[PDB]
Symmetry: D2
Subunit: 359 residues, 4 copies
């Protein structure tokens, strides 16, 4: 069977024929892959930065149900949930390995579990999210968007601690969010926060790309060029109710944006920084105490968040049609080995999402 | 009228007769002071570390109602809430200036507002907490305990984000708390967490004092001497679900204890750190993201928290009688000027709470 | 100015020119009406079943902003929130008159407040919901859908009382809802519950209409003909986690469906029952106690719910395109007086929403 | 082994020696019974109103730990949790069989499980609540109080649906509770709500008893003689935010109190009504809809609620010492057969709690 395979911790990737019989099966439902998505985590494993001699790559997939089984009919499009539980802890037992207490969960295409960059796989209906045919084209985004749905859900849950965090009109329209770093993560955070009605500023150390300018315009989002720091933003707009670190950057980014967090505010750490050490002095931390600020680590969406993501992607075809049409940057055929290896190995500037087509 | 006065931002304190006419009045109920408490906040203003020429010091008070007004009867004991609202924001409008959005709140005996170290004052029934005569002796602690009630309440609210944070038996008995630092704040966090049933480890850079040893034994709390760091605690007990910084010390303490935070855990910042800069490297921050960890600034209790504190102090006379009887370190007469000025200016080693008695 | 007017409690309705100076203004923004919606509440006032000589009818409107104000561009479509606060109670003061504690709120086109069946009106920006031009056709439904958004939000909030109400897969997909009474309210409850992923059964004392059959098939909803009661449904499907009374029917409907409520379940009372008395015996009530059942009165959506409604309407254009195009039964011109009076006075069988167009 | 045994559904009760091998064991810890409590449920079984030849009666117990086990020391006092889970559903698996989804749970001394009126039993440490020696005398009340702790917890959780249910001072002190029925349950509800600071009116169809009068005066609670209905209370006091049925009597009591429920209010059904049928008319039900009222079935406390009960009983020894000393009406020796059978068979007027002492 054709599969894209990796050999962690070693760098490298192959697109080749493997023995179908030694690949991981998860249930009774046979699913033929139509699309995969690629993201930074795939790039990391391919570049070695994270009885089986290999692992099937890929955790973003849309496939078609080959034969009707229970609630699933032949021809239905489905997406697998990628993180699966440890089987021992109470969070996993209620279907929420995002909060696994043991750390012994599996992650398709990354850890302990064969991924979905293969011709077909067998899965359990419990781990399958129904993808409407009407969002077949952008539906691949439901996996990355699920992470962001969970993250925003969590931020809103935490802010229930504030006696009144709503605005004079009962909404959250008055609350301002700073999304630091663009790319697929920043863009999806922005789209979702605008959908919820919060004001958004996107920030990056440069002017907007064509895609970001469309998002700015269509979603009525603000943009800040942070090339020379954040003083001018603070001077003009003031402080923010929520700040999202969506950069995989140097942790000194946090030193730049922490002074822009307002009273009762939340700093959501979503990106995985891979450089730097950030100094926090007593003045900064004392201020955090006095003003009820919170810093939260945000990771991993689960089935309910994939479903929310499907509804939002559907909404964006109507609300933000121009931005929705830019979520998918390009599609590469599984049969195009040279182009496939290139995109698996490295991101292109201004890439949102690369899709792999099985044919 | 006899009053203890300060002149911020200037260092210094005086006990003298002042014109009752230039003192702040807050409502129609006349209250004669019986006790005040002293804390580090009083020491700070006295030492200049933070029409009207002066401010009446003091935010911890128990007074007696001199004349029956509405629901308050003559002879009733009351304690005033010390932080009061800005009158503009929605949090203050619902009685919760602990989450004030303007920062224009008042704090009795500290900022904008005359305190309670005076023979008598007038107050509004809405800011008065009823103090049962059966806890007259230890009731002064309800004010500092209120801050801690709010803090624990907030930690538990935030942890509702975790799908299941309860244990196999439906309680929080399996959850472990590290309380860093053991003066009145760390001791009160320990007593309250044990009342809630969580396991507690107190930590200081030394062996316990007598009072602490009484807490250890009576409340079945654990103690760790952190003089040579925390590796041995980590190796023996593992990681903690909650960590409270109850030290007003160098922020590098957080560097020490962050590695001891467990999956889904909460670092509660309560102490007001006065020195240092702590480096947080990418590995630490990445881990925080991967494990859904949270850091929260904890400050200020309000009326419902004062009321909860009364119930808990009452409970401790039965549950923890030895500990409860050590909460009050000493009592100084308002008339004993040399001693009073001494205790206002500086803490004694091992002090928990000093009371000022009006007679 | 042309307006549709009533004189409660008397029966009758007129479409005529009225003096602008007599009509209620609510703010600085001029809005030219383009669409109104008609519902049962309108028919009730028209038929006399519910300093001003008259009241402007109507509480469902979409208008166009006439000038470029702060936040609102000229040509923007907006919808007014219909219930407005009493200005005294804490619920109203946080933008939530749905929970008004005084009952002294106003309801546009019903009580205290001129409605929106007029050429134009002046409003405060705080009461305006933005209606994307991409949902101009079905956007009028955002008002009725808002009541339903609030209702489901409240049901889900209440069900947080159950330690685990989610399913084996972390979703609510395993939860079953019985929606009693089809057409508009029942149809919208069904669409929204299926959007959230819950299983739905619609019930009416007849077979489905053409429109209901579309919704049934496209949303994968079940239908039960309740003409001879509920024994057959109970025997086949069992009991339900949520039951919604979406009928304005005799209260004895509740006696029929209460035996179908499952453990930990919620009976949502949304319809305004019009006759009857229902007996509850001790056996029924003790069983409610034993099984943690809840009965909840559900009324009125506010601004955040209108905004959620807009997102869901947009989603349905892609998720349920056939059903979405059957939401608007027909549009009547404001200038077609004979047909207008007819649709104001009586519902037609199987009607979902009639829209009035201003030209 | 001596044990008190019954044979449901037959009436009758025996205190005799029974074969130890025939009695249910629940774990490895041996617990020697020191006290049991008797309540209405016991009286019902004794009077036959609700593989084994018999069932050991009793679900209210304090026993002594025979050997120093895991976290339990020889001589420690413990109380068993009486309802135990089905082992299948997600609520039972998180330690919360109060919300069991299968109904397959066991109830010590009532259903599927031998009770605790026996010389000793073996238990699992997970089902054991530590009873401080400082509350040995009234600690037996922790089991009935647990049900009430759960109930008030649930009411407060449900009321988070109201945007602001707190008062001008951030507390619930402005909220009024009507407790209908003044037995062990009504008294316990009253004490706990007053502990939480809510205003309470107790109601019964007579003047108070001495015990009740003592509760009334010491807790600053109000009393209403409801012998001639509730019109006079409604006229004098108005309506209530919470109404608790602590009856057991005829369900028509609900018809009488429902008109006294206020906006956004909660009717808590705790008592097990024993007769009658109450009519609810369309006017009553539509007003429930209009005012966001809720009716909730309240049943069963679990381990966290036992632990909260321990803290509150301890608090009452200081807060309400006179009331606390009236909670135990009398103690009967296990060897006093004539008196024992008397108290098992029938309640005495004004009784709160009868305790059985194993001598
Ligand atoms: N927590 C979770 O569950 C989770 C899930 C998925 C992904 N992630 C992490 O999320 C992070 C972002 O993902 P992604 O796929 O969007 O990454 P990406 O494609 O690498 O995009 C990173 C964005 O950050 C911008 N950036 C870099 N330095 C910046 C700075 N100093 N200030 C502002 N912006 C800066 C980059 O600018 P340029 O456009 O000019 O290059 C780019 O737009 C990564 O660390 C990824 O690992 C976390
Ligand atoms: N956020 C709020 O609402 C709020 C309210 C009240 C107070 N506070 C702040 O809370 C903090 C504690 O108050 P407090 O009155 O208890 O202070 P305190 O009396 O100064 O006690 C501080 C404790 O920390 C110990 N300590 C110092 N350095 C330490 C270290 N490196 N590791 C472990 N322990 C260390 C001290 O040890 P020794 O016993 O050996 O001296 C002492 O036991 C202060 O910063 C205070 O300003 C905050
Ligand atoms: N709580 C709130 O905030 C709120 C807001 C808006 C509306 N409402 C109320 O919600 C209720 C429904 O609104 P609507 O506009 O959908 O009303 P509607 O157009 O009158 O629809 C009523 C539906 O119930 C069906 N029905 C009647 N008796 C039935 C029975 N015994 N069993 C099952 N179905 C039965 C009707 O059947 P047919 O199709 O065969 O006639 C119709 O499908 C009304 O009482 C309305 O006033 C409440
Ligand atoms: N839901 C649960 O988890 C749970 C748990 C435990 C108990 N319960 C139930 O709670 C109920 C109360 O328990 P209990 O032990 O307190 O019962 P109890 O000892 O029988 O007390 C009943 C009280 O109600 C009074 N009463 C009777 N009719 C009344 C009326 N029409 N209006 C006002 N008061 C009236 C009685 O008056 P007199 O004093 O004049 O006789 C007595 O004070 C019982 O039904 C019991 O089964 C439920
Ligand atoms: O923010 C939007 C709001 O302005 C309105 O249009 O409702 C939907 C939201 O997405
Ligand atoms: O019920 C739906 C679910 O099956 C999936 O498609 O996600 C969106 C939900 O509306
Ligand atoms: O109530 C607090 C008081 O205890 C002290 O810490 O000073 C700050 C106040 O918020
Ligand atoms: O918003 C509601 C409206 O839709 C209708 O039901 O009339 C009453 C209002 O509360
Ligand atoms: O209601 C009480 C309140 O008045 C205060 O005294 O604090 C404790 C509460 O129990
Ligand atoms: O931790 C305690 C628990 O073990 C039990 O005794 O109930 C009260 C709690 O304070
Ligand atoms: O689901 C997450 C995935 O989207 C990200 O790419 O890697 C971490 C996972 O938890
Ligand atoms: O715990 C409850 C008990 O107190 C009552 O007596 O019987 C039913 C149980 O659920
Ligand atoms: Zn990915
Ligand atoms: Zn796990
Ligand atoms: Zn203080
Ligand atoms: Zn304020
Ligand atoms: Zn309407
Ligand atoms: Zn109001
Ligand atoms: Zn009992
Ligand atoms: Zn169960």
């Amino acid at each position: 069977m054709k599969a894209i395979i990796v050999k962690p911790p070693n760098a490298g990737v192959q697109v080749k024929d493997v023995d179908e019989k030694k690949l991981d099966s998860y249930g009774k439902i046979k699913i033929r892959t139509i699309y995969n998505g690629i993201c930074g985590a795939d790039r990391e494993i391919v570049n070695g930065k994270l009885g089986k001699d290999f692992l099937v790559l890929g955790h973003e997939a849309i496939g078609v149900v080959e034969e009707s089984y229970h609630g699933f009919s032949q021809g239905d499009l489905v997406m697998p949930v990628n993180r699966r539980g440890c089987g021992i802890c109470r969070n996993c037992l209620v279907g929420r390995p995002d909060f696994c207490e043991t750390g012994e969960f599996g992650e398709a295409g990354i850890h302990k579990m064969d991924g979905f960059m293969r011709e077909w796989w067998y899965d359990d209906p419990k781990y399958l999210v129904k993808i409407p045919k009407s969002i077949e084209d952008i539906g691949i985004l439901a996996q990355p968007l699920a992470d962001i749905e969970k993250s925003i859900e969590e931020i809103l849950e935490v802010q229930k601690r504030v006696p009144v965090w709503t605005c004079d009109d009962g909404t959250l329209n008055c609350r301002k969010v700073l999304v630091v770093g663009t790319g697929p993560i920043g863009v999806l955070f922005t789209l979702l926060f605008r959908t919820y009605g919060l004001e958004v500023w996107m920030a990056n150390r440069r002017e907007p790309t064509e895609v970001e300018q469309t998002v700015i315009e269509e979603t009525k989002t603000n943009y800040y060029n942070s090339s020379n720091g954040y003083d001018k933003l603070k001077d003009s707009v003031g402080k923010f109710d929520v700040i999202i670190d969506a950069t995989g950057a140097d942790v000194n980014i946090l030193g730049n944006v922490i002074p822009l967090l307002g009273r009762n505010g939340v700093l959501g750490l979503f990106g995985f920084s891979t450089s730097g050490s950030v100094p926090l002095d007593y003045k900064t931390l004392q201020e955090i105490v006095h003003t009820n600020k919170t810093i939260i680590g945000l990771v991993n969406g689960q089935k309910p968040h994939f479903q929310q993501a499907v509804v939002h992607l559907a909404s964006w075809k109507t609300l933000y049609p121009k931005a929705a049409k830019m979520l998918i940057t390009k599609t590469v055929s599984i049969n195009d080995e040279k182009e496939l290896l290139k995109v698996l190995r490295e991101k292109e500037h201004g890439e949102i999402k690369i899709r792999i087509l099985w044919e």
